[PDB]
Amino acid sequence: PSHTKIKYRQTTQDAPEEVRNRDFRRELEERERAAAREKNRDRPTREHTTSSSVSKKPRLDQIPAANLDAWDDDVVFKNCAKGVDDQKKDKRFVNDTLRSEFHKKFMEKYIK
Amino acid sequence: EVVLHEDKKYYPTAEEVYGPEVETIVQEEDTQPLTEPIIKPVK
Amino acid sequence: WKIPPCISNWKNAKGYTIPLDKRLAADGRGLQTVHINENFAKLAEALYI
Amino acid sequence: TMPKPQWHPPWKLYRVISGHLGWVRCIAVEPGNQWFVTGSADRTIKIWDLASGKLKLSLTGHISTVRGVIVSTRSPYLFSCGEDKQVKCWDLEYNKVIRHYHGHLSAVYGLDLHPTIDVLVTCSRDSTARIWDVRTKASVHTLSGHTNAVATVRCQAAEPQIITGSHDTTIRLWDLVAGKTRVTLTNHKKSVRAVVLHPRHYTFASGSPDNIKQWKFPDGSFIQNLSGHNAIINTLTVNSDGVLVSGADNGTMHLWDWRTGYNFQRVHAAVQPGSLDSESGIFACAFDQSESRLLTAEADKTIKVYREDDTATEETH
Amino acid sequence: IKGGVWRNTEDEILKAAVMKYGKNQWSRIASLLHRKSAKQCKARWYEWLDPSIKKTEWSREEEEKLLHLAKLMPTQWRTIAPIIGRTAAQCLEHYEFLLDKAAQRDNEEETTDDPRKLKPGEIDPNPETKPARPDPIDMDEDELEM
Amino acid sequence: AKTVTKQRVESHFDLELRAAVMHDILDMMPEGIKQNKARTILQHLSEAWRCWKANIPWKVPGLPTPIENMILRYVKAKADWWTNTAHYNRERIRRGATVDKTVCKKNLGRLTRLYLKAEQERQHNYLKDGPYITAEEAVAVYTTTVHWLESRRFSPIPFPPLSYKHDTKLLILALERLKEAYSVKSRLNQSQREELGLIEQAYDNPHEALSRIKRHLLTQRAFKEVGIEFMDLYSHLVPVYDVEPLEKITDAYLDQYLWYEADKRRLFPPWIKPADTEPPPLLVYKWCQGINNLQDVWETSEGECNVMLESRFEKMYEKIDLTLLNRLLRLIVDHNIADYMTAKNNVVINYKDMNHTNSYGIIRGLQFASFIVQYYGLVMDLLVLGLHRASEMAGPPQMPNDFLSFQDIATEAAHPIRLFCRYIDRIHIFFRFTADEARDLIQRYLTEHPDPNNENIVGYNNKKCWPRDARMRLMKHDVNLGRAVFWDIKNRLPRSVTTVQWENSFVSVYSKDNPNLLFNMCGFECRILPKCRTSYEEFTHKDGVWNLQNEVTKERTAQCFLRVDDESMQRFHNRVRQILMASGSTTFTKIVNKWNTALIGLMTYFREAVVNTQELLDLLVKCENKIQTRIKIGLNSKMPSRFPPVVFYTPKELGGLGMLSMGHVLI
Amino acid sequence: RVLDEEEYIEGLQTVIQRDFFPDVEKLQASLDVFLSRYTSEDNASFQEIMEVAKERSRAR
Amino acid sequence: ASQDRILQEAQNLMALTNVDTPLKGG
RNA sequence: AUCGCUUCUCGGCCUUUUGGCUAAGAUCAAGUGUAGUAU
DSSP: OOOSOOOOOOOTOHHHHHHHOHHHHHHHHHHHHHHHHHHHHHHHHHHHHHHHHHHHHHHHHHHSSSSTTOOOOOOSSSTTTTOGGGGGGGOOOOOOOSHHHHHHHHHHOOOO | OOOOOOOOOOOOOOOHHHOOOSSEEEOOOOOOOOOOOSSSOOO | OOOOOOOSSOOOOOOOOOOHHHHHGGGGGGOOOOOTTTTTHHHHHHHHH | OSOOOOOOOOOOEEEEOOOSOOOEEEEEOTTTTEEEEEEEESSOEEEEEEETTTTTEEEESSOOOOEEEOOSSSSSEEEEEESOOOOOETTTTEEEEEEOOOOSSSSEEEEEOOTTEEEEEEEEESSSSEEEETTTTEEEEEEEEEOEEEEEEOOOOOSOOEEEETSSSOEEEETTTTTEEEEEEEOOSOOOEEEOOOSSSSSEEEEEEEEEEETTTTTTTTEEEEEEOOOOOOEEEETSSSSEEEEETTTTEEEEEETTTOEEEEOOOOOOSOOOOTOOEEEEEEEEESSSSSEEEHHHHHHHHEEEOSSOOOOOO | OOOOOHHHHHHHHHHHHHHHTTOOOOOHHHTTTOOOOOHHEEEEEEIIIIIIOOOSOHHHHHHHHHHHHHHHHHHHHHHHHHOOOOSSSHHHHHHHHHHHHHHHHHHOOOOSSOOOOOTTTSSSSSSGSOOBBOOSSSHHHHHHHH | OOOOOSHHHHHHHHHHHHHHHHHHHHHHHHHEEEEHHHHHHHHHHHHHHHHTTTTTTOOOSSSHHHHHHHHHHHHHHHHHHHHHHHHHHHHHHHTTSSSSSSHHHHHHHHHHHHHEEEEOOHHHHHHHOOOOOOOOHHHHHHHHHHHHHHHHHHOOOOOOTTOOTTTTHHHHHHHHHGGGSSSSSSSHHHHHHHHHHHHHHHHHHHHHHHHHHHHHHHEEEEOOEEEEEEEEEESSSEEEOOOOOHHHHHHHHHHHHHHHHHHHHSSTTTBSBBBBBBBBBHHHHHHHHHHHHTTTOOOOOSSEEEEEEEOOTTTTTHHHHHHHHHHHHHBBBHHHHHHHHHHSSOOOEEEEEEEEEESOOOOOTTTTTHHHHHHHHHHHHHHHOOHHHHHHOOOOSSSSSTTTTTTTTHHHTTSSEEEESSSSSSEEEEEEOOOOHHHHHHHHHHHHHHTTTTTTTTTTOOOSSSTTSOOOOOHHHHHHHHEEEEEEHHHOTTTTTTOOOTTTEEEEOOSSOOOOEEOSSSEEEEEEEIIIIIIOOOOOOOEEEEEEEEEOOOOOEEEEEEEEEEHHHHHHHHHHHHHOOGGGSHHHHHHHHHHHHHHHHHHHHGGGGGGHHHHHHHHHHHHHHHHHHHHHHOOOSSSOOOOOHHHSSOGGGGGGGGOOOOOOOOO | OOEEEEHHHHHHHHHHHHHHHHTTTHHHHHHHHHHHOOEEEHHHHHHHHHHHHHHHHHOO | TOOOOOHHHHHHHHHHHHHTTTTSSS
């Protein structure tokens, strides 16, 4: 004998009486509209916040800059790694368990 | 034209096959922890 | 929709003798034909001189 | 054409969700239309947000493939069944399994909740269907009489309260009070894997690889033969507007008018990039409560979400 | 001795044992042939008794492709042997053969130097690449029981 | 209705797979088909699975495509289940979860198949794509080595003469380090008994074997297949290779010959550091006092920086192009040796059903592989250092310098790189930058990689082993400098040859804002603090710190604080976990000998580094209590305590177990 | 451009002297561009045989 | 004669394999 | 030309036949002497 009492959904727990009064088309569309807008809107806010920090840097650096007192040429190879931007491999999902990005990192870690 | 085996590309990008009008979403990680429930109890 | 019969490269649970022509006919590993990229000949004639 | 079909807008893919590591075998929509469960052969149950598509929560407890998942409409419970032989109740207030319903001899292929009497019914490959009381976890009845694997079960309050199709090509209509077969319908030549009840009209449809047939309750009177989708069909779902969706194991998906049987659209979606051209396949599809999104659970480990082309009509005939 | 030179008697049992057991059961074949291990029995098949070996004479287009690939990937015979379709032993030997003819006829008499590069009185490191002794008239107790 | 608890899992799943396929083949057949051949289709599935594990291409000549498409689906389905269970079990084994010897054996057996499948792909791609090292970069690499060796006036290692009287001595050393593999046990298989037979003959008649070895070098170019298998260390897997005895005996002599002659020639400059005269902890000592003897090294008055870079040549062994390697080896040795050495790497690797030709890299298990790695490493050291600076570190051929010295103080100042060594692949570099040089080097980096966002401070590797006041401060100047040094070094090396990665390297900056520089040389790690800086006292509290003098004046100028590396701690813990497995463990004295041997392997290597690493002392107490409980269970006892300590620690001559103690237990 | 093997080696020879060993001329008394444009006649012949070899396997 | 290209190719290979290393005078 | 009996060859049935899985499940080796059983 265990859990001898059926928990029933309360009013605030998506009760069927509220579901009976549905306009789900409007509510779903509103939610999708809001979520799409906000998720995109997140990106300029970051830049907006970074703009404050970017502006703070000249002021900060001026205090050391204020006058408070009052060899590579002999390497045979150049620019071998110029333009390797790592940002594109980790965003690709591949539905193949052997060529998956997870599996490549897995083998590098566990077999030395 | 030189490609390394560790950099070789085997398959198209997801946006290229479905085309621009189709959204693509990939989700490896849960946005909320197991302690934080779905149907919130009446506090 | 006839099905060619399975003849493994391994198990033979009832100990039967199977003729070699059935046992060896792994055609799928023969057709591949290894090939060499020409760029070796650039390398191998660079170092040699 | 003798009847004139009602025009229905064609559907179009707009969202390919991805993130499972095995075949997605089940899908179900929550009654308040906020989220939807999937269960997969990666042995997990993932709560996905229906609007944003964000992965809400991943659940873990199964030992093998998850075959059926259903959200309870009256109680805050999430019943799930698998090839584990295990049928579990996930109390969503805690995200923990509280009661798991042993008793089946082999794999559990599907499950459905009776809408008014809070009773769990499950299909099994062992040619039996068991009826479970939620509260007491006790076997009420063992519906035996199929000779082969029972594939799909649906429940309704009106008689006949339980409908099962199976792999023996027969469909049995059961009396819930007695536990004995009322009608045995043999008209399919091949395995019935899907049965769906229409929400308003007192009629149901059944799918097998030969043909999809629409049948009339209570005695199972033959109505119409809906031919044209000749593949192994896995699921059937119907919108209250009379849109019938047939998704097949070869990944072809046809959109059908319930009243006339007119095939107004065929949809052959494309595979996730790394996947293999024979992997394309549909195991589950379900409408949301709004009846304006179609959530299909695919065999290339994806969830494809479709909505309706809002444009004026040219396509009609 | 375990291993050694290959006779004709062992080769007929070796063919017949691949019929029973296949090309992935070498310790079941080597339990049927004493004084030979499974590692040796595997090597003997793959380098002189697989009928896919083109045991015929080298043509002109084979030699032309050999000489290129010998220049192209120095000393890496095993990388060359599936491309020209011959055993690497045969591949190396024939390359050594071709070099010997050209240099000798252009500069030298019949031998001139080292009449015994041959190795008498010691084991060969790889007699799987060598043809088979015939079967002696008086087969002993070991061979007849085998 | 009995459950699928644990042992039932795999047999249950393989039933459900085949039961599902049964349903599909009934439905897919046209309704007039002969109601048979269902069992035939299933046997093709079982064959396709076996071909997938063995990496053989499965193909049936006449199979109809509705069946073939079904089987190709379900094999992939089973593969996705099979692979993910290998991932899941390995992530349990590493963290030390509940495991048994069966699942450890099985999971190793899966991982080694998964490795080989990736490895066969990689070798095949090389022939199809063509050699990743360009025909212009290769010539550059080769020409560099030529001018270097000419400058040293290197005399090539000849083919070993017939009358070369040292040969018998070298043979004996070769055989002895072969026989040491068989000290473990008397239980031998056929191939091992054959090896001891060949060894005994070589002792009994040396002039036989020496003629046979020399005949191999002159003539043998096609070698037999080598086995592969993996040593399981839990945290990672290490390849082990099995070479046929007759080849192995020749290779062992050749390895002994080459190292003797190269030493005599003075091939390797002194920065190639696993050296005959120096244990690894002595290396770290000479490194620390090597830093402190540099001129002006702690001054920050103008704004000088010191930068210390640790890195690895990431995939050094795995990339080595044999066609290039053959020509490089020919600059050192007689060509007959060079041909042998090259050819010996081009061998069929074999593990059960799986075979492929190795052709793009060296085999680490060959007896002379340690020679090749250091010579190839020497080729790449010249790339990083450049010809000019490398000649100053090694000094004139008449009179070469030792490890960390130069001819003049004036020659130290001529270049930023003041100290260099390479361990095997691990690189250590110490830079001294003046005020202006540090600014200009930052600017170039930012010109390629501008960061207005201040992302540079985010992904910067720092060591948590030390307090917040001890680890590196992420000052914007120091962070920008640290990255920019690594960027410059990484550019020197062609990606086709080798590469360096930020995720595994480490950089530390001594600066006006950071007083400590950290590094992690061998198995243990340390930080140097000069006494004119934040310490301001000649402390002497721990014995776990080195006071180190300036060699000129004999004044102490800095302190070096030792700690054990986090990795080295994990290595020891897994060794204790390994001891607690097996069934011979019931024999009490067989455990305590393994515990003692492990404990002295830690302590006598790290010495005073242990006591300062309070995290590791707690692990020692834990490990000791566990093994003592294992003895107790061998006498039942269970939970009731008060078991006497005398039985463990009493020396073996009195009949006790002789356990070594490293905890505050009391009688 | 297919060049005769003797002619090919000659052109290659000149290039290497200029870029890597400029004192050779005194003692007696780009590379990637060249290799991209010219091939030995032997190398061309090998490519032809490899194409025919694939065809023969296909025809089988 | 050069028409027997195999004889010319074999001669070229002999010269390229057997030469002793550049660090000693050729 | 047709039917029946008896030799002689062949096609389709002959899946009527390989009744699972895991780390190809794992591992790989021999010689001499005495007592009991059978002829």
